[PDB]
């Protein structure tokens, strides 16, 4: 308090003190580019090894669904069924919910249903993982000319890499971009019916000679007396080599000749999932993304991953080179030195702005040392607190630098003031400064946590957000007020002792003459603040709102879709121009791409590609026709001359949990009992229906597979069985034929590798090859299988959904140039209601967390508004005069409403904290206004005309300092045009714009607000 | 089973898993010659041992397939209890009728 | 062991290697006489180790049910010479026929540290010296191991190494948090540095 | 200070010790009794007093 001006050692010592912990907090506080904003998921995935869409659907995603019951904090669920034989089920939780406790809950009910799923889904393990998507770097691993394929690479990586990475300090998981090794023996019809045998037989012998045989011991116990041996029996071990395979004996003939594995089928090394074509700059190529800790440091973590990496590269075997596709920590790097640049620039700013005003070093010397203090000390609340270092955070601790500031300035200046009048020396001019401004700090600091609290207290993924900001804001603000109340003042009374001058004296003679003859017709003014109302009326209907402005995070996505039942070859052509695209035309900008055929964001299949093209770094690229966006742009229009493609590129979103803030996502769920063709005619019925008004929705489009011919085989029974063939040996040929066979595991260098048993490649391409199969009786006579099967051609889905247990389609879309997300959704809502009875609608992703939680802001914001007010009739001991105050807030948000129009920016959580800090500057300057015009009314005896005017004139100067060092200090803001430029040119339009008017707006018109309450 | 097979089959199997937890200190195991697998995992002082025990038992599903037949059913024991005994009690017989 | 006065009882706490008995089994031999490969390796792996068959009810509780041979038939390596395999024709046939026996050497107990090949190995301190001595001293005769072979600390000896490096930074953190406190209770920087020469004393 | 031997924490008394026999590779249970009995026999016949 007061009693900290006579003990300047006390003061010294806590500053002291709070330098310190910010320093220890400093040296251990986790790092990362973003905080946990997504809601905690948990994904389960089943696998079938040659299982259709339908045949999954039924066997293992209903099972698995009806059993996800009983979990705490489930939002929702959604699942997939591909023709690639994969089961997928997403469950998202409520925000809050512990992603262990939810994962071990779902692992359990899975766990407890494994026994009702079929025992090829259950041989190859349901694995329950936690998705979190804060992926930190995604390392590749390519060949150099021609030496590994990709199935070597990943198996290298796998059996090699893996297990040195997940033990790293700070690393959490790894995740591997490939198929390692498996033992493929691939059949061949001809040689099988020559020998009379059947896959059947194989997959026996198989299983019977690649065995592992506890012998038991030699001696052991119970043993005889006077036992003096016990050894250890081997009996059989687990094959290794493919020749060992090879040699395995199927049968014996009444020649005498034995006949092997090798004489009916090819043993060779291959990979356990052979759909999946990676390329790195056109070579074959295996990547890792390590996926981080809690609690970890990104930069450490990924400095010690490098070194790792560097010291495996010297036992790589031949031509295998490491290469970083997006890499996060140069963001993060580059956060942190803005935060220090912007600190820095705002301390000589302040310097500049003191010794061009007061004109005397010593008063210039006391902020110098205040702010890092206060910097250093929200440093170590927010390491006490419990939070981590991200953009969101360093943010609101760059506004907090000019809220501190702001306090350091008004203190000094106040105590230069009191010893340059009154002739007092500079410690009882200390004493009486602060005995004039302790209250009006303390209200101060209660109406700012009033109105930083609502950000705080959200819902969804946006509080999240909110709540970063709010912290940093409220922790530095209240640390700002203790040091300003504790330091501030024992420096002044230490330290200090006891052209522009001329311009500057006429200039506030100017303002406080027309302030005070200025009342002679105040209504006009005040019709004035209602077309100023009336602004920020029709300035906040035009606002386009955002939520996270998109950065040039230096990678950015392509995605080719061939129209239907395309192999890989072309989807594998198609990605080759892709690549070949952006390394001849944009190789200035562009370094990699990173090409995965097979795999699409719309489902796994033959016809999907992706492509993860990464750009040069900043410094290389300079100008717009260099920047992500014109890059994409460019690449539109190139990539659209590729014909049986659907080619499409655009940029990663900035937080990977959401994008595209104009956008939708429903599920249009069936409901009823109608079919997939029913609801594939309904889903016909919109899209086109929508598309009837683009007035309001524009992107109307299905994420999923559309309807595809299959293959089907009618095997009749009857004549199978009067010939003597059982219909099961028809079946498993045909399954074990087409679609593989995993046998059992069996031993590579020490590592557990899977063995599959699958019909040769030119036997399994055509209908005519189901011709060439053959089965055997029970007298033991092969006969072939085109006897009893006929053949014909359907239709089918290759991918179905199901959304919280009913089939769904997911119909994702956009809405209009100006026409709000409510609007759009309340638009498909009784869009749907045209569509034939049944079927029904539901928001999943972002949509849900909007028909959630809508009606919170308003309220959080009348609560901070009742409270605000509150405040300010406890420190003025009055009803009408907080009036005077809460009638300038207007005036702050007007301009920043104004500059953020003329700029052309949109609303962003970067513009509403920037125009949080600027509304409660502005009430800030308000407060200290109108509590020396209440002093000057209480003691001294003059009327509130005379008492404003003179609060207004003695206030005008440190409100000159502040807003100029505020202006000049976010003005670097605005011109920054280099890397991670969005955020920057918010705060900065924002700032600029906001506290400008907010200034010249409030000096003039709080007397008028002040004379005009009062006489009210 | 002898102690090259399990160590082989079963407690590399299981130990690769172990990797993504917490606050792991270090990791011991051994495999024995009377089919013994007995992965230990330390982690560091305050860590919730319940916590621990859950991420161990979800990462343990993960090498649950891969495991033999004869492995499985037996069963996986994860004991987050002390690892040191603190009493033994034993039970002999006065006379001699019972024998061990 | 050649070091008496520094550390005593070195011991490892392990299993050294043992002989270990391989059977072959000729499976084109045995497929040509008849019997099957799964029959020979279940009769051998039933008669020499054991067979968990059923659950069963002994005074209200349930136990296990085991097959196994009997104490005298598997004791020598002479005693696979008296097991029988069925020919798919019901005709028994010796299993000394189509098998062949030899001895091997193997590890009867395998361990890991972290994820690699370790051995543990404890030890005591000798009379005088104290644990850290101990330590350093293993540390030291470790490094001049062959190449390729580390150490590690686990156990007790983690903990004392944690405490013996941390210990000197609680000590300077103490001393400077008791000058802070000093020099804010008495408005002075002289009285915390006349009190802080004493600290040494 | 920098001569001084250092520790974790000092022994005690806790009235129960242990004792460890390992027998050469390949030795039978018959040995490993007998090796034991030893053990026993010495700890209960000199030193019946403790
Ligand atoms: C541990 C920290 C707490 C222990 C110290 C506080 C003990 C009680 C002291 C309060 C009564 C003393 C008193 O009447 O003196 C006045 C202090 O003001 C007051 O009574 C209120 C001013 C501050 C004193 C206590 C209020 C909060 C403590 C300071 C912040 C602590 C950390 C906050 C996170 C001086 O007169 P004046 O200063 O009012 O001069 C304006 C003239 N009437
Ligand atoms: C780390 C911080 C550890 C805990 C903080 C201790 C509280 C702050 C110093 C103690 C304190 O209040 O000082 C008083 C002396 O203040 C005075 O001599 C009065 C100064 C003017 C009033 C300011 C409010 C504090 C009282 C003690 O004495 P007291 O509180 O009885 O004060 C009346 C007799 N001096
Ligand atoms: C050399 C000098 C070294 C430094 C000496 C001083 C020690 C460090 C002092 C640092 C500066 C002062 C910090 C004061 C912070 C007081 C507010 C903290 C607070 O309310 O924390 C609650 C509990 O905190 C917690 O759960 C964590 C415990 C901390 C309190 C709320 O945290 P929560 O767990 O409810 O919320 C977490 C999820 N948002
Ligand atoms: C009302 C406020 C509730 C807690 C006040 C006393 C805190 C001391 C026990 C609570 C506690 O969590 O213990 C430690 C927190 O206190 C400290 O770090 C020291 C508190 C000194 C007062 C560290 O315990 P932890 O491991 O939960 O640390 C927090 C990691 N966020
Ligand atoms: C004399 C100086 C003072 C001037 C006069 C007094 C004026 C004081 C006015 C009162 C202001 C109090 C503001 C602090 C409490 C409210 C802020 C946090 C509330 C909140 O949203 O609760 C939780 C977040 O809090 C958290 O994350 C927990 C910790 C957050 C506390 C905010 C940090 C305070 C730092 C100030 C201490 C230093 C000042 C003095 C040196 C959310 O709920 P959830 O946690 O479930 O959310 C899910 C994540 N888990
Ligand atoms: C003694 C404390 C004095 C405060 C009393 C009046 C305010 C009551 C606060 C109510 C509260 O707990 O805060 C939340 C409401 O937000 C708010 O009320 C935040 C707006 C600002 C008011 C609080 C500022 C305190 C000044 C320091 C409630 O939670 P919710 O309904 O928002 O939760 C849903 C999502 N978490
Ligand atoms: C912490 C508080 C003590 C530290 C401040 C030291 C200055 C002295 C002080 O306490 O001033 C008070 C100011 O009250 C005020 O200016 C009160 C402002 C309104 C606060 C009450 C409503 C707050 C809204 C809800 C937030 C509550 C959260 C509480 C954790 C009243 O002292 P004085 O006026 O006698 O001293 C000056 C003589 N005139
Ligand atoms: C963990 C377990 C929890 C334990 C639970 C049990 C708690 C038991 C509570 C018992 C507390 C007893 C409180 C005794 C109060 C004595 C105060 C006497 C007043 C006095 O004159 O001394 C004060 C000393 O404070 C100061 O001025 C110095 C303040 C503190 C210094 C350290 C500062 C930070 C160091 C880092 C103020 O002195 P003054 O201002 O009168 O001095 C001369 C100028 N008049
Ligand atoms: C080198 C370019 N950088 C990236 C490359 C990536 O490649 C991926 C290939 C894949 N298949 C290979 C067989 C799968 C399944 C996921 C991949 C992800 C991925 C991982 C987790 C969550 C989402 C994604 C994802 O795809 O979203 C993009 C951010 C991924 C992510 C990034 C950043
Ligand atoms: C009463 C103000 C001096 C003590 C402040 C608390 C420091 C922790
Ligand atoms: C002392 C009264 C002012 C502080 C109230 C809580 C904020």
Redesign the pocket.
Known sequence: ??YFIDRPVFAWVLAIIMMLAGGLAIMNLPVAQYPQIAPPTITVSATYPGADAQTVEDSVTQVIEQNMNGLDGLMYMSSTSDAAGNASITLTFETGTSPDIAQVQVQNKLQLAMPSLPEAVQQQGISVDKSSSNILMVAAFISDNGSLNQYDIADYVASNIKDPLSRTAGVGSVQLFGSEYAMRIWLDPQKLNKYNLVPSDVISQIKVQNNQISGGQLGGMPQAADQQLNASIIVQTRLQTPEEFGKILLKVQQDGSQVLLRDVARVELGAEDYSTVARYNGKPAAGIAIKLAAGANALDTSRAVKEELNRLSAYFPASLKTVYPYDTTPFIEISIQEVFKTLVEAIILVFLVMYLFLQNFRATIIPTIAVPVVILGTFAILSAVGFTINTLTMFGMVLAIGLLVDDAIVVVENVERVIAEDKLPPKEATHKSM?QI??????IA?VL??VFMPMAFMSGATGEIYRQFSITLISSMLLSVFVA?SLTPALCATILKARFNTLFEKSTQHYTDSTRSLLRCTGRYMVVYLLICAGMAVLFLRTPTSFLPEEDQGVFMTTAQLPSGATMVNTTKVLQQVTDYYLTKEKDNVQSVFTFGGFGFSGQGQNNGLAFISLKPWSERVGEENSVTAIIQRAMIALSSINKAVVFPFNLPAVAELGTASGFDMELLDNGNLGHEKLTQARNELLSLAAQSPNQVTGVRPNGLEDTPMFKVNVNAAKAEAMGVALSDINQTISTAFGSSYVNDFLNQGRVKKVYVQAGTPFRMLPDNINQWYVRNASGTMAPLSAYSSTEWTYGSPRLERYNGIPSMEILGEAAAGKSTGDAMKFMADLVAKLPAGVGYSWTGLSYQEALSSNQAPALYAISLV?VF??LA??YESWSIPFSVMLVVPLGVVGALLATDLRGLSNDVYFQVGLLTTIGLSAKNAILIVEFAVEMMQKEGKTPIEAIIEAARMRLRPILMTSLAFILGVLPLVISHGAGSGAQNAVGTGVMGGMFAATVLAIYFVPVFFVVVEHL
């Open positions: 308090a007061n005995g302790q209250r009006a700090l303390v209200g209660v946590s009033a109340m409270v509150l405040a406890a420190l």
